Amino acid sequence: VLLKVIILGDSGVGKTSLMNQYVNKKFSNQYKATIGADFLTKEVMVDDRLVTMQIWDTAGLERFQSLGVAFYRGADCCVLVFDVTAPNTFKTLDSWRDEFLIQASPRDPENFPFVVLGNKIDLENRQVATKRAQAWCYSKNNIPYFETSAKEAINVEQAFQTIARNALKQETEVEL
Ligand SMILES: Nc1nc2c(ncn2[C@@H]2O[C@H](COP(=O)(O)OP(=O)(O)OP(=O)(O)O)[C@@H](O)[C@H]2O)c(=O)[nH]1
Ligand SMILES: [Mg+2]
């Protein structure tokens, strides 16, 4: 059982940090822009069930975005990340959501698993209100929302638990 998860979001929101924190329990304040898309794997237990989580990290900068988009189509869950201290990254969520739908072409789009992460909550200069973020998530088809901190490892395991659970459900429905 291989679960494919795709992480999308603007440059600098912390996609790579979140993945490394979750997969390797490691964080680095040093920024290294992601080029293209690639994955890291992590075997995990989803409600007493072993699965191989294939987590795809992508380039937030359009300049480093690859033309290869085949990795999308079989996705079981799409993770949308934004920076709680940067409203601009929150306003682009619809574009990221739409890009995922277009590239993955899931059947029954409105029910495909999306999980939103408001990252960098550890910073004092927060600018995106929780209520505002929850409202957007609700306007979608009520997709789960988690406020996280890759740096302080806050809510990372919890968020990925839901990501893994929902990805499994989607995966199961597909094979059926
Ligand atoms: N305060 C804080 N800063 C964070 C956190 N996670 C990442 N950052 C910083 O946000 C910056 C971007 O982190 P990355 O993980 O490289 O961001 P990205 O989304 O992978 O950027 P691209 O690969 O270019 O799309 C870096 O300065 C990180 O140190 C976090 O939880 N809290
Ligand atoms: Mg990156």
With a Cβ cut-off of 6 Å, ligand 1 is lined by 9, 11-17, 29, 31, 33-34, 59-61, 119-120, 122-123, 149-151
What is the number of structural domains in the chain?
1
Which residues, other chains included, contact 74 with Cβ-Cβ below 8 Å and sequence gap of 6+?
4, 104
How determined? Answer: X-ray
- Resolution of the experimentally solved model in angstroms: 1.9
Distance of CA 38 to CAs 3, 52, 79, 104, Å? 14, 15, 15, 16
**Residue 144 corresponds to which tokens in the numbers above?**
């789960």
Please state the three-class secondary structure of the chain as a single string: CEEEEEEECCCCCCHHHHHHHHHHCCCCCCCCCCCCEEEEEEEEECCCCEEEEEEEEECCCHHHCCCCCCCCCCCCEEEEEEECCCHHHHHCHHHHHHHHHHHHCCCCHHHCCEEEEEECCCCCCCCCCHHHHHHHHHHCCCCCEEECECCCCECHHHHHHHHHHHHHHHHHHHHC
What is the residue range of 33's domain?
1-176
Take atom 13 of ligand 1 and give the residue whose Cα is closest. Answer: 14
- Nearest ligand 1 atom, CA 59: 25
For residue 112, report the distance from its CA to the centre of ligand 1, in Å: 26
15 Cα–ligand 1 center, Å: 7
**How far apart (Å, rounded) are the C-alpha atoms in residues 128 and 104?**
29
Give bridge partners of residue 118 from the DSSP assignment.
82, 147
Give me ligand 2 centre to Cα 7, in Å: 10
Helices 156-175, 15-24: crossing angle, 10 deg rounding:
90
Tell me the CATH number at 133.
Answer: 3.40.50.300
Ligand 2 (ion): residues with CB under 5 Å are 16, 34
Annotated binding site for Mg(2+): 16, 34, 57
Interval between CA 117 and ligand 1 midpoint (Å): 13
State phi, psi for 157 to the nearest 5 degrees: -60, -40
Pocket mutation for ligand 1, best pick of 31, 57, 61, 148 (most atoms within 8 Å of C-beta):
31
Which ligand 1 atom sits nearest the alpha carbon of residue 34? 23
Q: Which residues, in sequence order, are CB contacts of 105 under 8 Å at separation 6+?
A: 73
